[PDB]
């Protein structure tokens, strides 16, 4: 997050960080208290054995324990039609073995229903634990930023990406720069304000640096993959 500010302890209970080897790697959001939605590029073959993974939720500053007080990931399900070259279909699910009952500052986010009628220049918020300016370290405190959504036609310009954005992904951010996520902000809650309820419609997959001109942020469109998530949840139970 570049150009943002520290996120105050308000009500944003949809950010769970997945830690392996006692170090922060990536984060994501939750929709139901039985699964965790995250990226798929961090679950590659060298990142197998999901038993050695923990989940931290409702934790702003990442210092409250040491190899304990976490949720063990039971099973990880990745998208079958995943390509490592173009980085398409970057959506993965991780099921926890704990019930994770609802408490203070614990509330999931509902999935976007088909037919949201989203505006072209829609305002959204981004958050995550990444660098500060460029090639930095993991942020100790939780920060957030405000971005705008851009159309896919303008994002596919020859001077921006030269038609390298799949229809399953969208573009968001500012063309002038200074507002972008750096390395480490995998996933991240991308919600919007509509009907007094937030809707998760974004999922960070890749990007070309941060705070750079002509390099917007690329997010995953979970609306097309909603039926896949429903099928996986139906087949799991």
């Amino acid at each position: 997050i570049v150009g943002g500010e520290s996120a105050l302890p308000g009500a944003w209970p949809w950010q769970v960080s997945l830690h392996v080897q006692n170090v922060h790697v990536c984060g994501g959001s939750i929709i139901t208290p039985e699964w965790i939605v995250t990226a798929a590029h961090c679950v590659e073959k060298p990142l197998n054995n999901p038993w050695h993974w923990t989940a931290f939720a409702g934790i702003l500053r990442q210092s409250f324990m040491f190899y304990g007080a976490g949720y063990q990931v039971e099973k990880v399900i990745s998208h079958p039609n995943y390509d490592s070259k173009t980085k398409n279909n970057d959506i993965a699910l991780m099921k926890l073995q704990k019930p994770l009952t609802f408490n203070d500052l614990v509330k999931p986010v509902c999935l976007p229903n088909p037919g949201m009628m989203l505006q072209p220049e829609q305002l959204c918020w981004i958050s995550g634990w990444g660098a500060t300016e460029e090639k930095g370290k993991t942020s100790e405190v939780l920060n957030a930023a405000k971005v705008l959504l851009i159309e896919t036609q303008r994002c596919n310009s020859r001077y921006v990406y030269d038609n390298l954005i799949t229809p399953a992904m969208i573009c968001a951010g500012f063309l002038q720069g200074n507002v972008d996520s750096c390395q480490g902000d995998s996933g991240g809650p991308l919600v919007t304000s509509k009907n007094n309820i937030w809707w998760l419609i974004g999922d960070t997959s890749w990007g070309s640096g941060c705070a750079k001109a002509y390099r917007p942020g690329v997010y995953g469109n979970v609306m097309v993959f909603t039926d896949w998530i429903y099928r996986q949840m139906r087949a799991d139970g």
Binding site: K85, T86, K87, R158, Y159, V160, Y161, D162, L164, L175, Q176, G177, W206, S208, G209, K212, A213, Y214, R215
Partner: protein, 237 residues
């Protein structure tokens, strides 16, 4: 003698602002500055007392807080010529000639830009060699001005991808902060520093293409076999 001046000239309209018209008879002044120029037929309505037009923003601005008189008059088309000279210095520095247009045509600017002394529409050819996609032409810029700002960056698999500034054009760019050419509005008694130059058609010595100059238009000035000319008279003291 104002009466003789109005009689010997084919006066079409004569008014004034912050000053009366016939009060000049018998009155004494310190100095009188006269600014005369032709009137385009299409943008004739942009000469009123207060208008957000392109003429008052890039060609000539009329002050409202000063006692100034306006005179729209006509001149026969016999034995008359129009001098189309560009008062820009940095434009002609890189090999700008003339518009080469027909007779009885005047040129008016719609977008005026301003640049600093350290500016060169030219890239260092040593860096452009390691470029494969969107490779702009380069040449040797004279000393005292930095070369074009271009950076080599990889998105997913493109190693030789060079992105420069001022894209696509300085008139409508995606990041005006990264391009040194900035929009400027002319003031009282100040000309336009220069017009927009397309850096993609520039570049031996850095010689930009004559068709790459944008930010101007041409229009005839023939009305009832006569040309209309506006004149502003400002009396100091």
């Amino acid at each position: 003698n104002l009466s003789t001046l109005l009689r010997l000239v084919h006066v079409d309209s004569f008014s004034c602002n912050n000053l009366d018209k016939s009060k000049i008879f018998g009155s004494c002044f310190n100095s009188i500055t006269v600014d005369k120029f032709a009137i385009p037929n299409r943008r004739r309505d942009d000469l009123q007392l207060g208008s957000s037009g392109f003429l008052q923003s890039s060609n000539y601005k009329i002050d409202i807080s000063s006692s100034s008189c306006q005179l729209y008059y006509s001149l026969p088309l016999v034995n008359v010529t129009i001098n189309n000279f560009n008062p820009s210095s940095w434009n002609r520095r890189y090999g700008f000639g003339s518009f080469n247009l027909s007779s009885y045509d005047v040129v008016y600017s719609d977008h005026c830009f301003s640049v600093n002394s350290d500016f060169c529409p030219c890239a260092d050819p040593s860096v452009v060699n390691s470029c494969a996609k969107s490779k702009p032409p380069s040449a040797i810029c004279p000393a005292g001005t930095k070369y074009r700002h271009c950076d080599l960056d990889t998105t997913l698999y493109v190693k030789n991808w060079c992105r420069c500034s001022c894209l696509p054009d300085p008139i409508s760019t995606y990041s005006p902060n990264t391009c040194p050419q900035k929009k400027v509005v002319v003031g009282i008694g100040e000309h336009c520093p220069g017009l927009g130059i397309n850096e993609e058609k520039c570049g031996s010595s850095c010689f930009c293409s004559p068709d790459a100059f944008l930010g101007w238009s041409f229009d005839s000035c023939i009305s009832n076999n006569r040309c209309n000319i506006f004149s502003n008279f400002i009396f100091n003291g």
